Symmetry: D5
Subunit: 155 residues, 10 copies
């Protein structure tokens, strides 16, 4: 599996993808139909953060009119990172950034209390987002971060 | 309810709290017994990120030998933020920071697709962490971020 | 409703809008006539910070000679943020930045005193600017920031 | 009128003031009674961002048990700035920071359109915060920024 | 008068201006003949930091062979700031930056002693530079900064 | 003449000086009477930016009740720089910082046009502040930066 | 097992350890005798980057005269990170920093080629340093970084 | 041997190289066959961090369809550095960055203990990566950093 | 003599120069033959850091196939600075950067001890590089920094 | 020889050294008599950038009245770096920083032309400063940087 150490070719591909999606007024849910993969994984891949397996790349390529060069690039492992410079200003992204700023020390404390020394993985890891009704009217998003506990063992 | 615009008095209190917890070899779960509040909220408060109601402040104060000045400070709204300088280096905290760096644009995209313009709140918001078994051996942490959808409406 | 996680396409559209506005010597007030929306909101959208509803987008597009791709892009939710790098050097923008630097702790202190724990929203939010005469000669700007109070409650 | 070019002595006085306010469970509104000055100005002065005139300094000192060294220091012009490092992490302050990040270019645009070249002053300037009911239940903060227009004229 | 909230179109114009000036081997003094404006103001405008009024723009446009689009853009209020990133490395610019680094606290102290609380304006402001002989051989530059004092008064 | 490569000793001495100046209600002009040196030079020295000759160090020491250790430290060449971090937030200091941000490229252009390649010195340099009335009411500061021209010649 | 979200207490302990090591002229190899653990791990723990098991903590505490509070702190999981601000200036540390700056893209490229998508762990990880003779005279250091491959798999 | 002090021409060549490698679905191991040099060195050179000797440049050029301009550029000494801005966000590179962040002080300590004052070279230096089975299933990467010891000797 | 306040025109010219130098396989010493100027001065000019006198500009232009526009640009005083962002990552440049980081306070201390208050000039300044054999085998660079002492005198 | 990975204890020692040197009015030249070492090396060590061998430490300790704890700490290898934050503001240090900013690319270019690929060492390295008369009046400093060339060779 090929990989890139710089982001500019994948950012160009992502821009080609987004302009086709907006021109055709598609949803990510619709683009993902037939990949057999979870919506969050494929969306992240279309946005430049994961490789797609070849079959999923060709399924999404048919819906967005991508050429063979684009299909090849969609299968490459990218230089990951979706917030240029690390600190977002967009309010939607910032709220998730803010959760980590405020609750980061609590997450560390409770991980070590309940699991032990080590980390919760961001690689052996699954993300998903669910819309649920709010009991007081309106809607809520339940974002689930599901990661393997990897212990730190004295050697 | 009183508030502070600078963090040094609360950091001093947090250090008093942690040295009592380590000296007495207590868990956060044990300190929280009798508050009637969720473990994640009270842990964040002990770590300097929330005010406690007076009853919860006095319950935890009895377990950690805190004086009346400390009880008063525990009830104040703090200057929040738990990662000095915004960018963590500790690997445990960093993994949560990393999730937002990689999946931030995906979260934005799927929020706007499934909810619309606006944000998922970090204020009308609940966090919790659950330990569950991994089907392949080991354990996993399921962290749930549960926030109200607040729309952006043209005016 | 479509959205973008990166700013380059909306920055290009904004430049197209600004060069047409300058070539035609139009005002924002004149562009805004007949949009059904407030001048501050539509101006922010033209400058790349909000989506416009379809009919308002078509009204401004006719005055500025924009095509159907530009009309679609005007309706997309953007990656928000109008000050590259966060810190402005332009004196006009800097004064508003400076108001927050100097009065930020005062705002926090009085929000908590008069409302309680939590925030004043920048999303459930309206801005407007009004010109008033100064009694000592000259003119003043009255800028109104009108945000919903969102409480932080123990959970 | 004396002044300081560094913040540490004034930060010590602000800490002494906040610890007294919290000990006595006072409000800024109650501390301000009898100064004849606006709540936002006097609050900012107590938080280290303005000098107070002598009579106002003596009124607030009597409620906070300040001594003569502290009364003299409260009358000094400080090195202003209330957000260490410029970028806030506290959510309450951040929302006002975010307002400028999002609408900064819009404010510039409308200032130049409605007033002309130049700035809206942050010095010939008045700030106030008002609480009002939201018609849908809850409350809103109406923050007014009232600044003189100073034009940039070719010489 | 029109304005821009981003610098790229004006940077392009400034480049066109400088390339014609170097190609024609002109001085700013000669370009400024007949504008009715001072050399420092017009030089700053040509370098992208001020608008020119229409007739002065046409006077400089004739000497530099600029088109009507360029003339219109010369009349726009720019996004101001002449040092990318804020910190200069060029020795000539750095010396003026260094004067403020070293004497900044002295300037604050003496402004407050001789004028009072408030600022010396950078907008109600005139700059000029004169060359005078040095009595011990050589030449000196006398740069004069002439700014209005704007008091900070209790409100 | 002794020198220091770190600022903390002169920062402590500057604090000693300012606490005495405020306690005694002195002006810098009064402290400087009898040094035979310029107010701006001696003020900068008291604020940690220059050494004083012994005679001048003893004159200011008598006014401020400084001891022989402080007199020796006043004669030491300091590590210069009066704005921690380089970027000021205090409005009074920032205005002078802004003057360089806005007019830095103009200063460069006109130095090279009127003097040649090289720099205007900040070392062979004199600073002075004058207060003059403004015709429209109020007052203006005329700040004079007078520096040697030092050419850059090929080698 | 206890943990800390801030580094100040472990930095204090590390200083106590280092002053005893220097006063007693001990080596890390001698302190490590009888801990049952590897020299690199125990050295990192003494320098504030790992917890020690209780018995190993007592072994090193006896050699360095540490008390029971220090022994408890040695067993706490710390806030990890050994380079304040991320970027070292010390030449010895900088060379290892430089290896990553220069070869980072090569490491990523060869990890993906030889293992696949994912990471080489810094937690399931062992470090050791060995001294070997250089054939051309002198000595070399062979530093071994031994990390588990953690794949990124489509989900 | 020619060299460049800026990276953009070499970044263009690296892009041409990566697009060819991806188009032809080649491995670095396959590209390196016939150079007689180590895989890590040649990979780094292809990624823009080393010059290649002429014969090695011609061997890799033939597999990637490089022309004579590109062969000459591959032989030039580049401006080295593979992480724009110094701080990586890509998780694969970050783990190696994190190794230095955590163990940097330990490496310094053990270098000085086992070798003496001075540095472990990053120039007289060899890097290699080896894949080995993990006894518990899966695989590990053994990365060897092999650097000359250069002492700091008092002169 | 003309001057520029932005670097992009000389960066383009420097690229033109280096592509010709590499294509032609020239040395800087060969390019400089016949200018009557020092290799370090002319090399810095070619790399965008000085203007050349006309005679020298035409000598280098003939060797490099530069046209009359490039000759005019070579005579222009540039915006100086050769390390984007100030901090180099290239090992060759970094070593000189490191020399100042390590010995900066020593240079200050010894300048003030041996010369007095003031600076060693980087403007009235000459740089040169010599290669000499090392007694132990290999080679050494002797770099000479020769600058005017400029005293700081009270005013 | 012992070493430290943090700078605070050595900064404290350096302060003790400088206060005794200023109190006794000594020169570094006089302190260095009888050490057997060069003035630049010993000055750097006193300023916290090098260890001294034991007998030289005792020689300087006698002249500055340092204790046995101080003598031991003078012998430790420090965490090196003499400019907090990397960027100096002091004019005397800044001039040497500026020499590297301006001539850094020229130094790289000429090192590669005259030596080859690799670096000029900052560790196998000697620095000295000499005062020489200027033929046009005044004095100059000749600073010599003498570093070993370390080649970068293919492996």
């Amino acid at each position: 599996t090929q990989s890139l150490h710089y982001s500019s070719p994948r950012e160009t591909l992502t821009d080609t993808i987004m302009m086709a999606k907006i021109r055709k007024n598609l949803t990510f849910e619709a683009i993902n139909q037939g990949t057999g993969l979870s919506l969050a994984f494929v969306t992240a891949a279309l946005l430049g953060q994961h490789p797609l397996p070849e079959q999923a790349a060709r399924v999404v390529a048919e819906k967005l009119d991508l050429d063979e060069d684009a299909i090849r690039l969609l299968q490459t492992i990218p230089l990951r990172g979706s917030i240029p410079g690390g600190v977002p200003t967009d309010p939607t992204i910032y709220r998730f950034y803010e959760m980590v700023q405020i609750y980061g020390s609590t997450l560390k404390a409770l991980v070590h209390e309940q699991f032990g020394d080590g980390i919760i993985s961001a690689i052996n890891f699954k993300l998903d987002i669910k819309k649920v009704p709010d009991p007081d009217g309106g809607e809520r998003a339940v974002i689930t971060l599901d990661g393997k506990y990897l212990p730190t063992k004295p050697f």
